Amino acid sequence: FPIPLPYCWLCRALIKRIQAMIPKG
């Protein structure tokens, strides 16, 4: 369900999921 809610803890969980899909070196 893609819902854009402005919350700091939800933004930190989305940044950790993007880093787990694309590896940094």
**11 to 1, 2, 25: CA distances (angstroms):** 15, 13, 23
Q: Is the dihedral of CA 12, 15, 17, 23 positive or negative?
A: negative
**15 to 1, 2, 8, 10: CA distances (angstroms):** 17, 15, 11, 9
E strand segments, 1-25: none
Which tokens go with 10?
A: 């939800």
Q: What are phi and psi of 7, to 5 degrees?
A: -130, 130
Nearest-angstrom CA–CA distance, 15 and 24: 13
Quote the domain boundaries for residue 19. 1-25
Number of domains present in the structure of the chain: 1
Nearest-angstrom CA–CA distance, 12 and 14: 6
Lookup result for tokens 């940044």: 15
CA angle, 22 then 3 then 24, to 5°: 10
